[PDB]
Design an enzyme around this catalytic site. Structure first.
Site, PDB file in Angstrom:
ATOM      1  N   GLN A  10      41.130  14.755   4.464  1.00 42.43           N
ATOM      2  CA  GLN A  10      41.704  14.897   3.130  1.00 42.43           C
ATOM      3  C   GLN A  10      43.217  15.072   3.178  1.00 42.43           C
ATOM      4  OE1 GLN A  10      43.230  17.196   1.103  1.00 42.43           O
ATOM      5  NE2 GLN A  10      42.365  17.011  -0.959  1.00 42.43           N
ATOM      6  N   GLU A  70      34.743  12.302   2.128  1.00 42.51           N
ATOM      7  CA  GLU A  70      34.616  12.554   0.695  1.00 42.51           C
ATOM      8  C   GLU A  70      35.314  11.448  -0.091  1.00 42.51           C
ATOM      9  OE1 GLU A  70      37.169  16.073   2.175  1.00 42.51           O
ATOM     10  OE2 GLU A  70      36.005  14.473   3.123  1.00 42.51           O
ATOM     11  N   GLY A 143      36.439  19.084   8.459  1.00 41.37           N
ATOM     12  CA  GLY A 143      35.302  18.478   9.123  1.00 41.37           C
ATOM     13  C   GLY A 143      35.549  17.046   9.550  1.00 41.37           C
ATOM     14  N   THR A 144      36.076  16.229   8.634  1.00 44.14           N
ATOM     15  CA  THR A 144      36.352  14.834   8.964  1.00 44.14           C
ATOM     16  C   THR A 144      37.522  14.716   9.934  1.00 44.14           C
ATOM     17  OG1 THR A 144      35.536  14.182   6.781  1.00 44.14           O
ATOM     18  CG2 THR A 144      36.824  12.564   8.014  1.00 44.14           C
ATOM     19  N   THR A 178      43.149  28.691   4.702  1.00 41.78           N
ATOM     20  CA  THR A 178      42.322  28.363   3.549  1.00 41.78           C
ATOM     21  C   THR A 178      40.824  28.430   3.823  1.00 41.78           C
ATOM     22  OG1 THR A 178      42.134  25.976   3.923  1.00 41.78           O
ATOM     23  CG2 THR A 178      44.177  26.787   2.941  1.00 41.78           C
ATOM     24  N   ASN A 205      51.288  25.137   8.414  1.00 39.49           N
ATOM     25  CA  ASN A 205      51.523  25.070   6.978  1.00 39.49           C
ATOM     26  C   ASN A 205      52.389  26.203   6.453  1.00 39.49           C
ATOM     27  OD1 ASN A 205      50.345  22.719   5.783  1.00 39.49           O
ATOM     28  ND2 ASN A 205      48.307  23.551   6.223  1.00 39.49           N
ATOM     29  N   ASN A 227      54.074  17.437   2.315  1.00 40.02           N
ATOM     30  CA  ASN A 227      53.859  16.048   2.701  1.00 40.02           C
ATOM     31  C   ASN A 227      55.160  15.258   2.674  1.00 40.02           C
ATOM     32  OD1 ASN A 227      51.258  16.959   2.718  1.00 40.02           O
ATOM     33  ND2 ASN A 227      50.537  15.658   1.037  1.00 40.02           N
ATOM     34  N   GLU A 253      59.629   5.744  24.857  1.00 35.24           N
ATOM     35  CA  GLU A 253      60.694   6.616  25.330  1.00 35.24           C
ATOM     36  C   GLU A 253      60.286   8.081  25.312  1.00 35.24           C
ATOM     37  OE1 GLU A 253      63.107   4.665  26.681  1.00 35.24           O
ATOM     38  OE2 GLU A 253      61.503   3.402  25.869  1.00 35.24           O
TER      39      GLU A 253
HETATM   40 MG   LIG Z   1      38.464  17.468   5.553  1.00 37.94          MG
END
Ligand SMILES: [Mg+2]
Ligand SMILES: Nc1nc2c(ncn2[C@@H]2O[C@H](COP(=O)(O)OP(=O)(O)OP(=O)(O)O)[C@@H](O)[C@H]2O)c(=O)[nH]1
Ligand SMILES: Nc1nc2c(ncn2[C@@H]2O[C@H](COP(=O)(O)OP(=O)(O)O)[C@@H](O)[C@H]2O)c(=O)[nH]1
Ligand SMILES: Nc1nc2c(ncn2[C@@H]2O[C@H](COP(=O)(O)OP(=O)(O)O)[C@@H](O)[C@H]2O)c(=O)[nH]1
Ligand SMILES: [Mg+2]
Lengths: 436, 431, 52, 92, 426, 427
Positions: A10, A70, A143-144, A178, A205, A227, A253
């Site tokens: 995500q 998702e 998870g992903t 989180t 973060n 981001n 390099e």
């Molecule tokens: Mg995820």
């Protein structure tokens, strides 16, 4: 010369959404697909080829695939402004989430989609001619990103081999986080990120949150600003490949001049100047102070103190109005400061890279348009304390076998938990012995 | 008749060659179009040494371009005199060595050395009497150091009797770009000390020093350093292209400067170099030429001559000058500062005179002095090399490509007994 | 209230006090002993001195 | 009639070309939290930028661009005045 | 031919050298832009001693300017005749000594004397026959006393046979600028008594007295004092630059004034010096020059010769003159006050004649007297040194740099033995 | 050459507000921050068309710093330079020395390095603070200690404000002053004394302002600072730099305390009638009634003197004036200092602040001497420190913060040793 980027999870495709918006604004590509003006300034013609492939004509599709389990965020990308830019076949989306479960996304759900990801990236590489290497974005807390990322990197390594795979991961901050079960995912991701990623760049973060609250003075920062900073870092990283400079440096390099041993690849990211629009006008922009600000721990992208460690090698990317003489003077100034020390392993632990095009600015962003900037990537031994700090709170959970029934049910067992613990301990020992 | 072919290695080599060809093409009066537009008739008679006549008064340089990244081809054709090179001479691979000596010497150099060997063999046999080969390159990069020295070796077992020049820049800790500079530099020196006939040592640190103190420029980019190197490279070969009162070919300087076959490392100076602010206080005399030629701050190497001894020295003079003044200035500089010259070689200084000065100038000079203080820089590189190699940092990038641990040890031993030879010859007694 | 009228007054008729040199009882000029303006200082602030 | 005064101001600022872009920067930087400027600060900026305008003209400009709800001569709407000055500058 | 190379130290030395070079350039007829524009041919033959041919009649002074602060160089370049100095000759430090002998002699001298030695060796070897060195500096400041002294010692070690002049100003208690003046003055003198070949002492209070009483000026700025010093310095080497009826080089002056090598401290005067109001009412004859040259109130040192003995004496003369009148006046002044001259050296006055007077003048004169009254000022400085050193005031700035108490003790030891021998020969 | 100034506490940053206003007025810099090279020691040519001072304001009460942020010089100051804490020390040395300071001082000294690296010819630091308060005394001592350990050899001048003998604004200021001077002894290079009643008397008797506030005090303190920095800033006939003070004014390492004076302090109407010459303005700079400290050096012996001259002055006149001063026997020097003067001449006249009470003058004098009445100042402070310490008043405030009585006794005996050293040296 081309580079293709894959975004996992995500957060990965959100970072990709920022990066590709920045790329389209920087290369002058209208989000419908075509370039209104054929003329080019600075880098010259054929500059866009490393990110956009010339499909038919009047379109330039990115060399990226968003893969995720998702479907909500992928469909949001599909429905938003950039419908025509991205190919409908590159935004790979699953049907159900991995649910913060390394086991689920590594053994149950990832198996049916990793093959499609591979047989799309295969033809993406086939369309290419001068592929420098891969570079990935993921967060090991999910998870992903953590689960499927390990399998995807393993299969990429077995299918391609020694090809460069730059890893821009997002570690959980020691205090601010989180999720709950994320230590398990992080450790089980490290056990393979050790032996599969060529160069790993750490990104916490909370460090970027502190940078935003302190420097850019947005008292309520969200993920979009983070981001955008990551996108600016990556753009300042690939500007040498994209555009012409005095001392251009390519992807291979970094591994040569920043990786003293194959199993030691962990880079602290730094950027300067991260300043607001009002602070930009009263503060002068020269190489000396923006180089000095690139080594302070207060402007690092990872919550760690390099003063507790020893620098092994450093890399300096310059953009804009930068000439060799003043950057040489600045890097000479740094070596005089005894506050920061270099390991006796490498006396000339510096590598400079100079580009000519200044970094672009995006409307709605918070960074100011500046004459020059610096993107710093170094290798030191604070990674050792970061890993042990995560290790302690991972070992807190495992003593009572909490949340372990979730992982075992999916198809894994508890042995790899122990081997990942041992691998992390061995990494701590390796970093400590290297620090000697 | 006496012919010099030019070989360019790496990005630095290509830029240095571009500046050198610009200044030489200006010297012989050919426009960036490539046709003759000069004034003096003395130019046309001796352009065969550097150019081949193609058609309709058009001359193409006798140069070969060799490197591994297309950005340098873009740079070569970006400036003027970029459309005068023959396109067939752009022998070129596209992978990029990437600051790796092993990549440019075992992996990438192995297959691309044959095409450039074909090009240089084709171009060298196209002329009658080869004076020698001239190569400008670097010891820091991968496509310039490793591939360059492998080509050096290849020409050496192919053509063993011809002369050989190597204008090579050696990285310094004061101005250091990359990390693995000593790893490439030590092995490049190891190969050069056995293959090259003589080496003309340059350094970016001394070039920046010259451009900052003497020239007093504000932004001395690589263009100014390449211009200084090109001026030196034009001054060294002046005797062949123009008549003079006392001519001096490359072999003459080589035999008058090299007492033993392994002592072929020189340091470089040029004269005159004055800032435009100090321009109207200057004089135009031989004494002010020899005053700046012998200055330790004018050397283009980061090695102080006063820290050692002058084995032999040479000076190439250009312009309408008197031999008597040159001889007496050389005698005076030899006799007054009598402690900086070696004792078992009387008359350490060799001189030559030419009548045609470089364009825009009335008089000039060039210094090539083989000194035993040049081992200072070799020790300065070897200490970093042995600091790194003691505990095997960055070694996996070399041993994981075909090389072994023996090559590093042999390079260290050869560099060590080279500096030992220089030291022993420095402290030798005449009796 | 102390600073605002001062700023208005100095903006109304902005005149900077130039450095006056006392004239000696001779034809010669004072020719001040030192000066913080010149090319020597400009040479001193050149950044290339830091690299060595 | 503040429009004529504004035309005179922009015509005067047409000369000394560095004086035109400087005034917009002065307005933006010295601006309040909102787009509010005091009359004293406005006169100070006008004198600093090099413009010599009679006090009646300054009062007319203040009344023309006065924010709603205040004393007619206490303040000035910085954003509106700057935006309307941009059109006058680009017209000449 | 014979060559004079100029060395300037400190702010005082730099201003003195600027005025001296302006005066000399005026004498030889070169414009402030550096090009010759004179009339007579006598102004070409002997200008190698001070200048160097560059191109197209451009002559560059043979000077090396030394300091540690950008202000002096900036003022030198800004003023007139400041565009004739070669920029490479502007050897220049950055931090400044600041009224501390130790900084300019041990720390700051270490990294600056190398460039000064480089430039002076480069220029000195350029000329064929160096007549000698010339140094003008100060004993009150830091970069003038310490750095200048270190340079003096280095030159004496490098070029031993060449001559060396030292126009050093010594601060006085009445006109006192700096608090720590005795500390610098005593050690600079201690080094000078073995290093310098011959020394001619200047003092600012004597110059102020001269410009008050004689020139009748109301505001004697540093310009007037530097003008007087420049005229004196130009007068010394006039015979080298122009023909005369009896020439005398620097060595010829030194041999006739130094009977013992450690007695080389001269007291200096200049004449004629008249106010502009009284310029009309004076006739210009040899007696008018001789009577003012021997006057005690005309001397540019803080020492009254009437309290001592003229051990040796000298006189430089400029203009188309009669040697008979010069000799008669010298004999008259010798035989009138016979108590002011030493007994074991008869005929203590050395005379020389040059036929080219300074511009705007028909006759001039210069006096260089090696008297034993020069030891008055040495005691006047050593008494302050002993009074303050006995309590170790300001000593922690000197000790904490490399110097220790032994340098100080040897300083007043040599001061005492010098003054003792000077008193002995009285 | 550059000099950067640090200001501590409520007093320090108001003095800075006056000082930087004077500096901007002198070099013709608009309050926005741009001119319509002599300024390089105070302002940096940042970006395009802007000058930023080499200054930092750091304080724990945010109200005064915030009011500075909204004053006339809003865009003059680089925003991150104005450090502002969360809560003040409330006249407690221990509170500002052990509890709050550890968080703000690290950021402050991190940001001073962002100014040091920009500097290439940094002469040295100089501090503005008052020891009467809490954050100026407590946090200031820690900041000076860390400056000393971090830099060491660079000069750190000081212009401190000890409480005045009888007029004061607080109660526990003896403790703060003693615990501040205990660290002020061995950390600052030169300390310049400044009291409030002396400046009030100067403004009352000379400038005849019946109701002066802190504005006039800060204005004339800024005048003194400007007159002592003009030698580095502008061009003069015979200048003195920062090092000259420590070379010619501190005969011993532990004696660095300077009595300051200024002349002429004259109004507009009196300026026309007085014929201002070097002689009397030098004379006025020696009378005890025109000093910035409520003490009479006539009780003591002068050890050194530093004279600063600005404008229409020539060396002959200053030499005559110093000779006349030296011949007077009303003031007496110490026997071991026979030449205790050091003259400095600059050609730039002092500028006048519109709306101010000083007038245009052709010349001015700023005198900075070392004497032995400062030992009387310290002894008079020690008397009333020991008076209330006997009954241990207010001590429960200090002990609760983390300190103990060891510091009290050690500072007391350190002050006593200072008195002994001052009386011995004056012999
Ligand atoms: Mg995820
Ligand atoms: N001369 C002068 N003195 C001042 C000024 N402001 C405050 N003071 C003095 O400072 C003393 C107290 O210190 P302050 O600076 O006010 O308080 P502080 O340093 O912020 O310490 P805290 O109040 O505890 O936070 C008072 O007794 C005043 O006499 C000023 O503007 N000028
Ligand atoms: N004098 C000079 N030096 C150069 C130039 N280009 C690069 N260098 C130096 O060469 C070193 C690296 O050479 P590199 O670019 O890696 O050469 P390559 O990779 O073999 O083609 C750097 O330290 C530069 O300082 C040039 O045009 N002139
Ligand atoms: N005669 C003369 N004396 C000067 C001049 N300039 C300065 N001085 C004297 O030199 C003394 C100070 O010397 P200083 O400037 O410290 O020398 P430095 O520090 O070595 O450069 C003062 O007492 C002045 O009287 C000048 O132009 N002429
Ligand atoms: Mg307070």
């Amino acid at each position: 010369r081309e580079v293709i980027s894959i975004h996992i999870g995500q957060a990965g495709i959100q970072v990709g959404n920022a990066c590709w918006e920045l790329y389209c604004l920087e290369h002058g590509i209208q989000p419908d697909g075509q370039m209104p003006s054929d003329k080019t300034i600075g880098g010259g013609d054929d500059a866009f080829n490393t990110f956009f492939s010339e499909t038919g004509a009047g379109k330039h599709v990115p060399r990226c695939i968003f893969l995720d389990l998702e479907p909500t965020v992928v469909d949001e990308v599909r429905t938003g402004t950039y419908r025509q830019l991205f190919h409908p076949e590159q935004l790979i989306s699953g049907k159900e989430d991995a649910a913060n479960n390394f086991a689920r996304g590594h053994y149950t759900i990832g198996k049916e989609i990793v093959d499609l990801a591979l047989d799309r990236i295969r033809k993406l590489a086939d369309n290419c001619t001068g592929l420098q290497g891969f570079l990935v974005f993921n967060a090991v807390g999910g998870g992903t990103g953590s689960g499927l990322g390990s399998l995807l990197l393993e299969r990429l390594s077995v299918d391609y081999g020694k090809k460069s795979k730059l890893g821009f991961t997002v570690y959980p901050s020691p205090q601010v986080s989180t999720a709950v079960v994320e230590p398990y995912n992080s450790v089980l991701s490290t056990h393979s990120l050790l032996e599969h990623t060529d160069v790993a760049v750490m990104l916490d973060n909370e460090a970027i949150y502190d940078i935003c609250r302190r420097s850019l003075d947005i008292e309520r920062p969200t993920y979009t600003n983070l981001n955008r900073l990551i996108a600016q870092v990556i753009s300042s990283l690939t500007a040498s490949l994209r555009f012409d400079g005095a001392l251009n440096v390519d992807i291979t390099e970094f591994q040569t001049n920043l990786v003293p041993y194959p199993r030691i690849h962990f880079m602290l990211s730094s950027y300067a100047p991260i300043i607001s629009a009002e602070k930009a006008y009263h503060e002068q922009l020269s190489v000396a102070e923006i180089t000095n600000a690139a080594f302070e721990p207060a402007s690092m992208m990872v919550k760690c103190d390099p003063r507790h460690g020893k620098y092994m090698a450093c890399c300096l990317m310059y953009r804009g109005d930068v000439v060799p003489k003043d950057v040489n003077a600045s890097v000479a100034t740094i070596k005089t400061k005894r506050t920061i020390q270099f390991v006796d392993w490498c006396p000339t632990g510096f590598k400079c890279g100079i580009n000519y095009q200044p970094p672009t600015v995006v409307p709605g962003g918070d960074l100011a348009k500046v004459q020059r900037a610096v993107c710093m990537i170094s290798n030191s031994t604070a990674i050792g304390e970061i890993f042990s700090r995560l290790d302690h709170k991972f070992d807190l959970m495992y003593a009572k076998r909490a949340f372990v029934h979730w992982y075992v049910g999916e198809g894994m067992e508890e042995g790899e938990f122990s081997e990942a613990r041992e691998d992390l301990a061995a990494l701590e020992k390796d970093f400590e012995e290297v620090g000697a | 008749m006496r012919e010099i072919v030019h070989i360019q290695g790496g990005q630095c080599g290509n830029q240095i060659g571009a500046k050198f060809w610009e200044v030489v093409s200006d010297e012989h009066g050919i426009d960036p179009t490539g046709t003759y537009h000069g004034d003096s008739d003395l130019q046309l008679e001796r352009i065969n040494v550097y150019f081949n006549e193609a058609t309709g008064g058009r001359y193409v340089p006798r140069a070969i371009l060799m490197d591994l990244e297309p950005g340098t081809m873009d740079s070569v054709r970006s400036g003027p005199y970029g459309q005068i090179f023959r396109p067939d001479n752009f022998v070129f691979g596209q992978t990029g060595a990437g600051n790796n000596w092993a990549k440019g010497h075992y992996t990438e150099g192995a297959e691309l050395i044959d095409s450039v060997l074909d090009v240089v063999r084709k171009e060298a046999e196209s002329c009658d009497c080869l004076q020698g080969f001239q190569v400008c390159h670097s010891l820091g990069g991968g496509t310039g150091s490793g591939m360059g020295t492998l080509l050096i070796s290849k020409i050496r077992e192919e053509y063993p009797d011809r002369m050989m020049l190597t204008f090579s820049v050696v990285p310094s800790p004061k101005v250091s770009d990359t990390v693995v500079e000593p790893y490439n530099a030590t092995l490049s020196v190891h190969q050069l000390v056995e293959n090259a006939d003589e080496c003309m040592v340059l350094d970016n640190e001394a070039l920046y020093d010259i451009c900052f103190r003497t020239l007093k420029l504000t932004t001395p980019t690589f263009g100014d350093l390449n211009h200084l190197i090109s001026a030196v490279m034009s001054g060294i070969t002046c005797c062949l292209r123009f008549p003079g009162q006392l001519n001096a070919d490359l072999r003459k300087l080589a035999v008058n400067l090299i007492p033993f076959p392994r002592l072929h490392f020189f340091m470089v100076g040029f004269t005159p170099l004055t800032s435009r602010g100090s321009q109207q206080y200057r004089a135009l005399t031989v004494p002010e030429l020899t005053q700046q030629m012998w200055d330790a701050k004018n050397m283009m190497c980061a090695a102080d001559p006063r820290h050692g001894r002058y084995l032999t020295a040479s000076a190439l003079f250009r312009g309408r000058m008197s031999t008597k003044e040159v001889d007496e200035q050389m005698l005076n500089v030899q006799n007054k500062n009598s402690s900086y010259f070696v004792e078992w070689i009387p008359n350490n200084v060799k001189s030559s005179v030419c009548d045609i000065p470089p364009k825009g100038l009335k008089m000039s000079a060039t210094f090539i002095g083989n000194s035993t203080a040049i081992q200072e820089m070799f020790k300065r590189v070897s200490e970093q090399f042995t600091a790194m190699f003691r505990r095997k940092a960055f070694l996996h990038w070399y041993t994981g490509e075909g090389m072994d641990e023996m090559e590093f040890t042999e390079a260290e031993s050869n560099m060590n007994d080279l500096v030992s030879e220089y030291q022993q010859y420095q402290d030798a007694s005449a009796e | 209230a102390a600073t605002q009228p001062a700023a208005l007054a100095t903006a109304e008729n902005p005149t900077r006090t130039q450095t006056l040199r006392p004239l000696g009882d001779s034809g010669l000029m004072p020719q001040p002993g030192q000066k913080p303006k010149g090319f020597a200082r400009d040479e001193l602030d050149k950044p290339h001195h830091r690299t060595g | 009639e503040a429009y004529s005064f504004l035309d005179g101001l922009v015509l005067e600022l047409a000369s000394r070309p560095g004086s035109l872009s400087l005034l917009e920067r002065k307005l933006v930087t010295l601006e309040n939290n909102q787009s509010l400027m005091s009359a004293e600060d406005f006169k100070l900026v006008l004198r600093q930028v090099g413009s010599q305008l009679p006090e009646d003209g300054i009062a007319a400009l203040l009344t023309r661009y006065a924010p709603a709800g205040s004393r007619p001569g206490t303040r000035l709407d910085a954003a509106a005045f700057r935006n309307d000055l941009r059109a006058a500058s680009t017209a000449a």
